[PDB]
């Protein structure tokens, strides 16, 4: 015991996904992130809501990390999901990721990290 009927831990997890969303809004601001800040976003490829080139998604069965630093365009962070253009083998491609699909967040500059979808 004791069984948590309030699911405080789950609510704290969702609350924290919001930091990713807030960080992506500063990154979407004209001028981008304040250097040397950059982001590493890891998400579940099969999670509902995520869209991307069929070829690309097939390459990454479950997890996929993307880095937002030197090569990303048109970052559009909506209220429930964000979309961005990145390059794979020099080829630009679009991605849409729900904040719900997120599993990890990391900014190497200040070593700040977050881990989600993990109830442990």
């Amino acid at each position: 015991p004791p069984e948590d009927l309030m699911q405080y831990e789950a609510m704290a997890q969702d609350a924290l996904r919001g930091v990713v969303k807030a960080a992506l809004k500063k990154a979407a601001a004209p001028g981008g992130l304040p250097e040397p800040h950059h982001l590493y976003i890891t998400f579940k490829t099969k999670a509902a809501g995520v869209s991307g080139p069929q070829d690309l998604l097939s390459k990454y069965p479950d997890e996929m990390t993307i880095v937002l630093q030197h090569q990303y365009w048109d970052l559009a962070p909506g209220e429930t999901f964000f979309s961005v253009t990145l390059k794979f083998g020099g080829q630009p491609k679009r991605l849409s990721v729900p904040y719900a699909a997120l599993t990890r967040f990391y900014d190497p500059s200040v070593q700040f990290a977050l881990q989600f979808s993990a109830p442990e």
Binding site: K59, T65, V67, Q69, Q71, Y72, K87, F88, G90, Y106
Partner: peptide
């Protein structure tokens, strides 16, 4: 880490 997208600085 292990990013999937290209990230070489310029």
């Amino acid at each position: 880490h292990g990013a999937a997208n290209d990230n070489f600085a310029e």
